Paper text:
Kinesin-1 (also known as conventional kinesin) is an essential ATP-driven molecular motor of the kinesin superfamily capable of processive movement as stepping dimers toward the (+)-end of polarized microtubules (MTs). Kif5 contains a N-terminal motor domain (also known as the head) that generates force and processive stepping via Mg2+-dependent ATP hydrolysis and exchange, multiple coiled-coil (CC) regions with breaks (stalk) that mediate dimerization, and an unstructured C-terminus (tail) involved in autoinhibition. Using engineered stalkless chimeric constructs of human Kif5, we present here MT-bound cryo-EM structures that explain key aspects of kinesin-1’s mechanochemical cycle and autoinhibition.
The fraction in the two-headed state was more abundant with [name] (47% of the total) compared to ADP (26%). Although our construct contains a 24 amino acid-long tail region, a maximum of nine amino acids (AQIAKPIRP) could be modeled in the two-headed [name]-Kif5bMoNeIAK structure. In the presence of [name], the MT-associated head of both single and two-headed Kif5bMoNeIAK states exhibited an extended helix α6 and docked neck linker coincident with closing of the nucleotide pocket around the ATP analog. In the two-headed state, helix α6 was extended, and the neck linker was docked in the 2nd head as well, such that a portion of the dimeric coiled-coil could be resolved. In the two-headed [name]-Kif5bMoNeIAK state, the 2nd head was resolved at lower resolution (~4–6 Å), particularly at regions distal to the tail and tip of the motor domain, such that low-pass filtering its density to 6 Å was appropriate to examine its conformation. Nonetheless, this revealed that while Mg2+-[name] occupied the nucleotide pocket, helix α4 was not extended, and loops 9 and 11 were not well ordered, such that the 2nd head was not in a nucleotide-hydrolysis-competent conformation.
Author numbering:
A (entry chain A): 1 to 37, 47 to 437
B (entry chain B): 1 to 44, 47 to 360, 369 to 436
C (entry chain K): 3 to 346
D (entry chain t): 918 to 926
E (entry chain L): 4 to 191, 202 to 237, 254 to 346
Write the structure that this text describes.
């Protein structure tokens, strides 16, 4: 059977994982205790009698949030050996997450992954959930990706990172961590889906009409995106799409694997009525720049590859009409070397609504994963912040004092300049 | 897990730490006898941070009280939360420092630092995973400045890879309690700069100003000032003890807030701070909390942040609140006050939200600010030091205990270098 | 009364070693002229670029020959080697102590200082004192006395830093200095790493003070000579450090970053010039921005496996060459002249 | 020239 | 201040084998310990040594005081005057590398090193030796044959001293022993040997430096063309009679011991004589020399100099 492993690293990863596993348990009809009162083998393991054990490894150097998982409503769902905690945090230090504090639980997480990998026949890939900027979600994820690439290698690896926003930010040493981790993990990940909190905040403010969005809502939206991504494995439909299909249709060149996800429709219950929510409207709104989950206007660039994953009551003729209307439009710009840059996936399972949730019950939904050159400007602004901080050489002593040469920053900056140059070259 | 060793040195440190422990015990539901009478399990979830266990469900704080006089120790013991402490942790001599830094750092403090370090070592060894050390002292006195500095040096040489956050009370500009404040303060900073990771600067003048202006207290006493200090002391380490959406440890705060090693002097603050009879008129929300936090009046150091630029700011929010609201408020504060922030550092503010507020408050926040304006305090201390040291005033008392004029010159040079470093980044 | 001098930064390229010639590595350094090296089609100009075949005598003659004369004339001198792991700092500075052809900068300097003393004017009287300590895990350890586990850096009347409590051994013959060097080397901290089997994990400092007194004219001169053998920047991927070696690497990297910050501050013309961020920067404060004629011997590896580190070292050497020193003769006033000035 | 070593007991 | 007498001591050697072969008798007779009677004419001296006395005895009776006084602040001088083959090498040098003899110089250097090893540790000693000899009123360095016919200059104080002679620092008693051996090897005895050590005691705590110079010199024969001894007999005749205009500059031998003769220096003199009967005429001349030499009285002050810091402080006032 087609089975996937989910790894959640850092606070952002584990929060998103809590949301995702609530969503999956709701989808497959599993009570939080693990008792169901097929189509679940992808994300769950069946024991002798009843108990379904999710294929997840929750890893964090901070014990607090994994302790919340251990004491929360989903307490008797996870295998306690899957939930792995440290003693001290990475403290927003890439060096702590990678060299010093990371190399104390890395053997444990690799052993847990191997034990989970030995219980799966048709392993398909890894769904690593982490966040750029944090010490753990930049250092430990890089070490883990290196280990997984060395050990498995041929197996796919998908990442769902929380990219730093342009203006909204939390940490002060975030650019350093982000550039270091995307320098290290550029050679190991195969398709890194990126989101930022600011775009999701704007989406919640405009579409969901909530003026005070919090982390729970953002995690629910990301969980819906990942459920749409992985729904082709779990349920049946016309034009099912696997992860290897994602890689072969979304990554033109080996160094261009940073797509940005988009979801539609994100509407409230009040606006669930008064709207047709047709396939054409869903696709058009999904290509709108204000609906992007990364703060970059796709109008400032060219789309390379765009895969559509429809769900629910969707007929292929409607999808073809929507794709034709998109292709005829002049505002959207597809690159010359891609005559056909559209992959479509239809599934018969409508999106599920978590009780006490902002999203409304809709018959159909889409998930637009596009590889566009508009993501280069985000790299540009992050590199500008890095250069400003590094000219005065601020905070460098914290990183250098935990096993990191001063030249690693320059190497990462050079690699990022090379990536920007590659994106510009592929644009022309 | 992630335990903190607390040390109280001198009269100021002891009478602030007593209020701190009363506050912490109230927050965690520990009655003065050491029993547990709380209401939520999150209080006992991380009680190991500030407390040890004992037979009979009795919790003893890991606090070490040190002084060269037994009067303040007797006062702490006789207080309402005095029997909670361990009777073996009271380490004291019988000859006070007499507001002599040399006496507390070279002659009388040396005879007691051995036993103090023995108690510190025992408490640290009983800990599972040590996080850092916490010290309360005053730079303007003898036992506090000198003994705390010597103990800090010894602990730093003993545990070089642990956080050492000290909550020091700096001399006030307009009113001086002791006539030897410049000497003691300069000699204490000369070692605080080298042997600490993050020091929080509090002066009684700003506390009095807060009490009379915001709190509208007619007769502020030392209890109220110690209470305001204890508020921010508890709020600094709230993520170590309670769950939250975005957690920040002491080391995370140090990494974010300390760009260069020697610039680790911070101005603390607290919010909300209203007066009885005005709470019914306020609106408790994140924008109001942020406006209160970034106000120059709410700072607990007599250094106006307007006469300077912020390097890094930490905002440790507490309670249930939107992350969008907090981040938007921080962004607009940075944008509206761009002149007061450093331009070679994007996003000067750091944000941590803990999902447990203090009792009776729906929201709370602690403001930690690394501003270049703290150079004014050091500049005035150096000016007074030069005025007193050109003429050798009150110097034979320090020399008679074994110090040299070269030590005074080195301390003054170190202070001047710190001032120059702060001025450079402005 | 002022004669400004720059830093005489000179580059030395070691040959490819066994661990690097047997694993697909290429000599990337291309040398043109006698003072510039081309790497990745990027010129870098220094005072002297020594190629792979340079002997110890040549580098000593072109680097440290003038320092003996400067020290004995009254000025202060200081030479310290810089680079990465397994680059050639110990080989350049000390090397094989007792080999006539493989000895380093320190033995040649001491032998030449004694020979020049012997060839001096008859009326001079010389006092020479030798100190030898190290910086290990941010602690100043005396390599001649193990009881002094950690020391402190104090300041003088004219605001110059110096190590206090270090053993100061007077010397008369080069044999005594060589025995001091041997005893110090025995106690210096070394560790086994993948890049270098005898890697040095401390910042060894060799100090000799030459006090010179003339009997006839009573004029007195003093000269301080520093010979520092720094540790190199390391990467955990290359070195593979685990345990104590990792802590040593952390401290070494932090100290080297502090030194780079101070060199950048001197080069950019900054004001704060952060000398106080580390012990090593404190000790070498007068060396880098004061009353010293300083030469930096940067050592580099010519392999493609170490191109980034070589470029970083080259940039460090290029930035240091621009910073200026204010050097003056150390003329200590005499007792007879003091009494004559009092009388008149 | 000559080199002197102090004779300290 | 203080006035101290220039001590005079009388030493007698056993009768030689040539004298007993020729039939010489024992004329001089010992009476008490503070005089010796010869030719039925008492001669009063500070102390008279018997023929068979040991050299350690004369060292303890004469030189140890010089050792301690030169160690503290006081210049010293000891020398021998007498006839040829009367015993003024064994009295001064004796045995260079035989422990039994160790007449004066090796014993005194070993004793000064022992005393230096003793006493307060907070003291810095710079001791310098300088060995030179003169002949026919020509000053010649003994540690280097290149130097010949040197001269005497004038220091800050009125004290003539040799200028240009090599002054070798010494650190160990072995170094002093080998330099003394080399100096004696460089000697081929009508020459006057001048041995000078300049012990310079500097105290770090009190910032007080004390310089002391002991002169272990040896004379030539007195059989009476010799001129230095004639002026040496003239200067003592000037000192014994007390007459001024003393001819210190007549001969270069007296130009070095000018402070030893009457200056700021406590000195002792030893004379050697023979009990033989064939040499009655020449024996009386040396006996009268010691009697007249006791008539001199010298004024001694501690050689104290102020350190460089001290002169700076006195300038401030
Ligand atoms: C009816 C009601 O809501 O009363 C409030 C109250 O009126 C106000 C004015 C309180 C009140 O505080 C003060 O007046 C005060 C006095 C001295 C020093 C500082 C403050 C209050 O006394 C304080 C008290 O605070 C607490 O209960 C917190 O848990 C607080 N506790 C203590 O400081 C404490 C006091 C005595 C004994 C043990 C603990 C705390 C804060 C941070 C960390 C730990 C604990 C609260 C909410 C109130 C009263 C009772 C009136 C305020 O203070 C605090 C700390 O909450 C003053 O501004 C706030 C806003 C509150 O609304
Ligand atoms: N979407 C989302 N983002 C989060 C969440 N928590 C933190 N972030 C983002 O993650 C970044 C901070 O990194 P964290 O993941 O909290 O840090 P960490 O990986 O746990 O590493 P350490 O705590 O330092 O050990 C900031 O950009 C936050 O905005 C969350 O619950 N949801
Ligand atoms: N010029 C040279 N010729 C030949 N061998 C050399 C040369 N320079 C260095 N090596 C060899 O490289 C090894 C030494 O590395 P060394 O030169 O000791 O490194 P290092 O600079 O002291 N390393 P580190 O202490 O980590 O900074 C020795 O065994 C030398 O023989
Ligand atoms: N006290 C003594 N015991 C034994 N032998 C002695 C003693 N005094 C002198 N002699 C010996 O007698 C001789 C005289 O010695 P020396 O001491 O050489 O004479 P001098 O008086 O120095 N002669 P000169 O230098 O020629 O004017 C030598 O052979 C001595 O070894
Ligand atoms: N807040 C507060 N400040 C104090 C207290 N006692 C003393 N101080 C202040 O501390 C400084 C004096 O130092 P002190 O601690 O008494 O001297 P020490 O006992 O030798 O350390 C002065 O600025 C006092 O105003 C107190 O109980 N509370
Ligand atoms: Mg965390
Ligand atoms: Mg080495
Ligand atoms: Mg003779």
């Amino acid at each position: 059977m087609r089975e996937c492993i989910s790894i959640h690293v850092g606070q952002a990863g584990v929060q998103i994982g809590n949301a995702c596993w609530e969503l999956y348990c709701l989808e497959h009809g599993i009570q939080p205790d693990g008792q169901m009162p097929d189509s679940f083998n992808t994300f769950f393991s069946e024991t002798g009698a009843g108990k379904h054990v999710p294929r997840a490894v929750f890893v964090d150097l901070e014990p607090t949030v994994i302790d919340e998982v251990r004491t929360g409503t989903y307490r008797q769902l996870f295998h306690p050996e899957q939930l792995i905690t440290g003693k001290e945090d990475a403290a927003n230090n890439y060096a702590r997450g990678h060299y010093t504090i990371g190399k104390e639980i890395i053997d444990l997480v690799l052993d847990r992954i191997r034990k989970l990998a030995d219980q799966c026949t048709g392993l398909q890939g890894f769904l690593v959930f982490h966040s750029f900027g944090g010490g753990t979600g930049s250092g430990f994820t890089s070490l883990l990706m290196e280990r997984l690439s060395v050990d498995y290698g041929k197996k796919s690896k998908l990442e769902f990172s929380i990219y730093p926003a342009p203006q909204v930010s939390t940490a002060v040493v975030e650019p350093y961590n982000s550039i270091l981790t995307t320098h290290t993990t550029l050679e190991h990940s195969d398709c890194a889906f990126m989101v930022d909190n600011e775009a999701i905040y704007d989406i919640c403010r405009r579409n969901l009409d909530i003026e005070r969005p919090t982390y729970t809502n953002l995690n629910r939206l990301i969980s819906q995106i990942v459920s749409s991504i992985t729904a082709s494995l779990r349920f049946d439909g016309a034009l099912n799409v696997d992860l290897t299909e994602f890689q072969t249709n979304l990554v033109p060149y080996p160094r261009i694997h940073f797509p940005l996800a988009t979801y539609a429709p994100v509407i409230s219950a009040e606006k669930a009525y008064h709207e047709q929510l047709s396939v054409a409207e869903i696709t058009n709104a999904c290509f709108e720049p204000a609906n992007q989950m990364v703060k970059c206007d796709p109008r400032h660039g060219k789309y390379m590859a765009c895969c559509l994953l429809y769900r629910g009551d969707v007929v292929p003729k409607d999808v073809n009409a929507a794709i034709a209307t998109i292709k005829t439009k002049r505002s959207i710009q597809f690159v010359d070397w891609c005559p056909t840059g559209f992959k479509v996936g239809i599934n018969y399972q409508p999106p599920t609504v978590v009780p006490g949730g902002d999203l409304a019950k809709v018959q159909r939904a889409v998930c637009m994963l596009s590889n566009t050159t508009a993501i280069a400007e985000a790299w540009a602004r992050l590199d500008h912040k890095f250069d400003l901080m590094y000219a005065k050489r601020a905070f460098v002593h914290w990183y250098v004092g935990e096993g990191m040469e001063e030249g690693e920053f320059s190497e990462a900056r050079e690699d990022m300049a090379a990536l920007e140059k590659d994106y510009e070259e592929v644009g022309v | 897990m992630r335990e903190i060793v607390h040390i109280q040195a001198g009269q100021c440190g002891n009478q602030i730490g007593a209020k701190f422990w009363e506050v912490i015990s109230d927050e965690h539901g520990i009655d003065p006898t050491g029993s547990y009478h709380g209401d939520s399990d999150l209080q006992l979830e991380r009680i190991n941070v500030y407390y040890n266990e004992a037979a009979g469900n009795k919790y003893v704080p890991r606090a070490i009280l040190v002084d060269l006089e037994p009067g303040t120790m007797d006062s702490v013991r006789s207080g309402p939360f005095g029997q909670i402490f361990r009777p073996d942790n009271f380490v004291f001599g019988q000859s006070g420092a007499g507001n002599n830094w040399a006496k507390g750092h070279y002659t009388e403090g040396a005879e007691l630092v051995d036993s103090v370090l023995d108690v510190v070592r025992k408490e640290s060894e009983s800990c599972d995973c040590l996080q850092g050390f916490q010290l309360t002292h005053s730079l303007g006195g003898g036992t506090g400045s000198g003994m705390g500095t010597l103990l800090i040096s010894k602990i730093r040489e003993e545990y070089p890879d642990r956080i050492m956050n000290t909550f020091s009370v700096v001399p006030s500009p307009k009113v001086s309690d002791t006539v030897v404040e410049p000497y003691n303060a300069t000699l204490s900073v000369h070692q605080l700069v080298e042997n600490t990771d993050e020091t929080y600067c509090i002066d009684n003048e700003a506390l009095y100003d807060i009490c009379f202006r915001t709190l509208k207290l007619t007769t502020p006493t030392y209890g109220d000032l110690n209470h305001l200090v204890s508020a921010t002391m508890s709020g600094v380490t709230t993520c170590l003890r309670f769950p939250g959406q975005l957690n920040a440890d002491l080391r995370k705060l140090a990494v974010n807030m300390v760009p260069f090693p020697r610039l680790h002097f911070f101005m603390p603050g607290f919010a909300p701070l209203t007066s009885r009879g005005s709470q019914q008129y306020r609106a408790l929300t994140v924008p109001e909390l942020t406006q209160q936090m970034f106000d120059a009046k709410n700072m607990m150091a007599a250094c106006d942040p307007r006469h300077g630029r912020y390097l890094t700011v930490a905002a440790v929010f507490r309670g249930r609140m939107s992350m969008k609201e907090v981040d938007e408020q921080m962004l607009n504060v940075q944008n509206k006050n761009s002149s007061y922030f450093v331009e070679w550092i994007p996003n000067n503010v750091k944000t941590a939200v803990c999902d447990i507020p203090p009792r009776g408050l729906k929201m709370s926040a602690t403001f930690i600010g690394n501003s270049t304006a703290i150079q004014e305090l050091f500049k005035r201390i150096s000016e007074q030091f030069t005025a007193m040291f050109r003429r050798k005033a009150f110097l034979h008392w320090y020399t008679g205990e074994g110090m040299d004029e070269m030590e005074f010159t080195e301390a003054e040079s170190n202070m001047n270098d710190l001032v120059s470093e702060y001025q450079q980044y402005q | 009364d002022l004669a400004e001098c720059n830093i005489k930064v000179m580059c030395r390229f070691r040959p490819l070693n066994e661990s690097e010639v047997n694993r697909g590595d290429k000599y990337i350094a291309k040398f043109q002229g006698e003072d510039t090296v081309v790497i990745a089609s990027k010129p870098y100009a220094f005072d002297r670029v020594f190629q792979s075949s340079t002997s110890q005598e040549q580098v000593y003659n072109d680097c440290a020959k003038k320092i003996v004369k400067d020290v004995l004339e009254g000025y202060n001198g200081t030479i310290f080697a810089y680079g990465q792991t397994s680059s050639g700092k110990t080989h350049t500075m000390e090397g094989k102590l007792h080999d006539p052809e493989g000895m380093g900068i320190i033995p040649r300097i001491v032998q030449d200082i004694f020979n020049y003393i012997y060839s001096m004017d008859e009326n001079l009287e010389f006092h020479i004192k030798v100190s030898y300590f190290e910086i290990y895990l941010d602690k100043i350890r005396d390599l001649l006395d193990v009881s002094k586990t950690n020391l402190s850096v104090h300041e003088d009347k004219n605001r110059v830093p110096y190590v206090k409590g270090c053993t100061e051994r007077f010397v008369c013959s080069p044999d005594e200095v060589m025995d001091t060097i041997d005893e110090g080397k025995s106690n210096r901290h070394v560790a086994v790493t993948n890049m270098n089997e005898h890697s040095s994990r401390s910042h060894s400092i060799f100090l000799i003070n030459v006090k010179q007194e003339n009997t006839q004219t009573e004029q007195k001169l003093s000269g301080k000579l520093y010979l520092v053998d720094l540790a190199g920047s390391e990467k955990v991927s290359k070195t593979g450090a685990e345990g104590a070696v990792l802590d040593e690497a952390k401290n070494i990297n932090k100290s080297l970053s502090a030194l780079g910050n101070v060199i950048s501050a001197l080069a950019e013309g900054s004001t704060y010039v952060p000398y106080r961020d580390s012990k090593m920067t404190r000790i070498l404060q007068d060396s880098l921005g004061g009353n010293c004629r300083t030469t930096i011997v940067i050592c580099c590896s010519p392999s493609s496996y170490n191109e980034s580190e070589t470029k970083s070292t080259l940039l460090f050497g290029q930035r240091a060459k621009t910073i200026k020193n204010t050097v003056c003769v150390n003329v200590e006033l005499t007792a007879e002249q003091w009494k004559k000035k009092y009388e008149k």
